[PDB]
Each structure stands twice: as C-alpha cells, then as structure tokens.
Design an enzyme around this catalytic site. Structure first.
Site, PDB file in Angstrom:
ATOM      1  N   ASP A  43     -35.572 -14.778 -19.058  1.00 23.05           N
ATOM      2  CA  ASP A  43     -34.242 -14.995 -17.630  1.00 23.05           C
ATOM      3  C   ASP A  43     -33.181 -14.554 -18.691  1.00 23.05           C
ATOM      4  OD1 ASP A  43     -34.074 -15.585 -20.922  1.00 23.05           O
ATOM      5  OD2 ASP A  43     -33.905 -18.345 -19.784  1.00 23.05           O
ATOM      6  N   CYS A  46     -34.753 -13.771 -23.577  1.00 20.25           N
ATOM      7  CA  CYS A  46     -35.740 -13.566 -24.391  1.00 20.25           C
ATOM      8  C   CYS A  46     -35.540 -12.808 -25.351  1.00 20.25           C
ATOM      9  CB  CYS A  46     -37.123 -13.848 -23.336  1.00 20.25           C
ATOM     10  SG  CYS A  46     -37.098 -11.595 -22.911  1.00 20.25           S
ATOM     11  N   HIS A 217     -38.987  -7.475 -20.741  1.00 18.81           N
ATOM     12  CA  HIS A 217     -39.188  -8.699 -21.137  1.00 18.81           C
ATOM     13  C   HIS A 217     -39.985  -8.873 -22.610  1.00 18.81           C
ATOM     14  CE1 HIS A 217     -41.934 -12.753 -21.240  1.00 18.81           C
ATOM     15  NE2 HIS A 217     -40.791 -12.879 -20.700  1.00 18.81           N
TER      16      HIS A 217
HETATM   17  C1  LIG Z   1     -35.863 -10.746 -22.209  1.00 13.50           C
HETATM   18  C2  LIG Z   1     -36.026 -11.399 -21.368  1.00 13.50           C
HETATM   19  O1  LIG Z   1     -35.369 -12.083 -20.872  1.00 13.50           O
HETATM   20  N1  LIG Z   1     -36.088 -10.897 -20.026  1.00 13.50           N
HETATM   21  C3  LIG Z   1     -36.163 -11.016 -18.879  1.00 13.50           C
HETATM   22  O2  LIG Z   1     -35.570 -12.056 -18.420  1.00 13.50           O
HETATM   23  O3  LIG Z   1     -36.866  -9.753 -18.330  1.00 13.50           O
HETATM   24  C4  LIG Z   1     -37.044  -9.915 -16.410  1.00 13.50           C
HETATM   25  C5  LIG Z   1     -36.981  -8.499 -16.489  1.00 13.50           C
HETATM   26  C6  LIG Z   1     -38.252  -7.668 -15.633  1.00 13.50           C
HETATM   27  C7  LIG Z   1     -38.172  -6.507 -14.382  1.00 13.50           C
HETATM   28  C8  LIG Z   1     -36.718  -6.545 -14.834  1.00 13.50           C
HETATM   29  C9  LIG Z   1     -36.192  -6.889 -14.997  1.00 13.50           C
HETATM   30  C10 LIG Z   1     -36.037  -8.177 -15.581  1.00 13.50           C
END
Ligand SMILES: *CC(=O)NC(=O)OCc1ccccc1
Length: 223
Positions: A43, A46, A217
């Site tokens: 989201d 993370c 992520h």
């Molecule tokens: C750290 C975190 O919450 N990451 C997230 O939401 O990554 C999802 C994402 C996957 C691919 C491209 C952009 C974001």
C-alpha cells in the site's frame, strides 16, 4: 491478517511469478539461507510497517534490550520538536508507538503484537509516527543526508517521507535505522540475470531484521 501475514514457507512465493526463470532461481537460492517469510500489504507503507513489526518481534522476551529501546523512544519527542513539528500535532502518533512498545514489555506475545499491526487504526498511527521521526532525523542532520543537489532536503521530506503511501529509497532506510539504532539487512530480488545480493544498514552491524525487496515491495524474512 490483512496487513502482516502468518509465517509461510519461503518457497510458497514461487507461485507469485510462475514460469519466470530468474525469480524462480533467486527464490530457490534465498531458500537456502532463510526458512520462512511474512507477507505485508502493498500500500506504499510496507517498509515502515515491516520494519516496525519485525524489530519489535525481535525484542520479545529480551528485558534489557526492551528497557534500552524504551529509553530511546521516550527521547524521540525532542527530535520532532527540534525539527519544528508541534507536540499537539504528533501526540496521537507518539502515544500509539509508545503503547505498542509497552505491549512488548508487559504482554510479550507474538499473537498480541500481530493483532496491533493488523488493526488498521493502530497500525497506521504507528506508520505515521515512524514517517515523522524519519523526516525529523533527516531535517536535523541535513549536512549528512544531502549526499542521497538540485532538490531541497526540506522539500524531499515534505513530499517523499511525511505523507502516507510514499515509497522508500536508501535515504529513508538509513535515516530510520539511525534514528532508532535498528540494524537491518535488505535482500534484493530484481528481474535481471544477476547475483542475489544484500546491503546491511549500518555497514558493520549484526542485523536484528531481514527484509526481502521485490516488485518495489518489502516482506519479512526469518534466518
Ligand atoms: C512498500 C510497499 O508497500 N510497496 C508497494 O505497495 O509496492 C507495490 C508496487 C508494485 C509495483 C509497482 C509499484 C508499487
């Protein structure tokens, strides 16, 4: 367990990229060094959510380490005030973080800690506190963090640190690690045909926490 999952076998994530040879190879390599993984909701929060949960879990049952950590957390309002945050605006976020530190001290179970990190309200108050501390630490040491020229440090903190759902880079990781004295190791799984590799924050240290970074992520690893 919508925000931080139950512990799963490492090879359970092969199914996220089936028939992608490089991801399969790197996950197989990772499985030689780590036994288990916890998944986090993607989201944009993370990193903070994973680091917060994993570090507090690593403290369970360690009475001296808990006492020293609580001593640092009690000083963190002075970091915020020195960087220009006002007490009446950070109070609710500081109180949520201090509450979960007391839960580690007084309750001491994985099940109670997992409950707080999966409660949307408590967990998001915790994440927002960690973001404001990251910003304060960067602002108060702007001479050191200019290295990570055209962009103001102040503008970087306002746009890419303080707001919920803004993604991390090396600067935010180094800053929160320094601000709370947490040593952590990040394992990098990208789509290039390269060696599985990692970085330790800071350089010399024995990690408390291991994170897996993949498709922008952060998930939690167990050694
Ligand atoms: C750290 C975190 O919450 N990451 C997230 O939401 O990554 C999802 C994402 C996957 C691919 C491209 C952009 C974001």
């Amino acid at each position: 367990f919508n925000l931080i999952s139950e512990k799963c076998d490492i090879l359970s994530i092969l199914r996220d990229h089936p028939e992608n040879r490089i991801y399969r190879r790197k996950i197989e390599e990772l499985s030689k060094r780590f036994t288990a993984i916890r998944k986090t909701k993607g989201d944009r929060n993370c990193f903070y959510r994973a680091l917060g949960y994993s570090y507090l879990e690593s403290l369970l049952g360690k009475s001296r380490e808990i006492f020293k950590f609580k001593e640092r957390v009690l000083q963190t309002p002075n970091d915020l005030l020195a960087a220009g945050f006002e007490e009446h605006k950070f109070r609710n976020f500081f109180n949520a973080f201090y509450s979960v530190v007391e839960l580690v001290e007084k309750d001491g179970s994985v099940s109670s800690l997992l409950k707080v990190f999966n409660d949307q309200s408590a967990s998001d108050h915790i994440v927002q506190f960690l973001r404001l501390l990251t910003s304060a630490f960067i602002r108060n040491r702007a001479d050191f963090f200019r290295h990570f020229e055209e962009m103001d440090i102040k503008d970087f903190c306002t746009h890419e640190v303080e707001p919920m759902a803004t993604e991390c880079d090396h600067i935010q990781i180094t800053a929160l690690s320094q601000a709370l004295s947490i040593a952590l190791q990040v394992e990098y799984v990208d789509e290039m045909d390269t060696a599985l590799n990692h970085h330790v924050f800071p350089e010399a240290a024995t990690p408390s926490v291991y994170l897996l970074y993949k498709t922008s992520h952060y998930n939690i690893l167990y050694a």
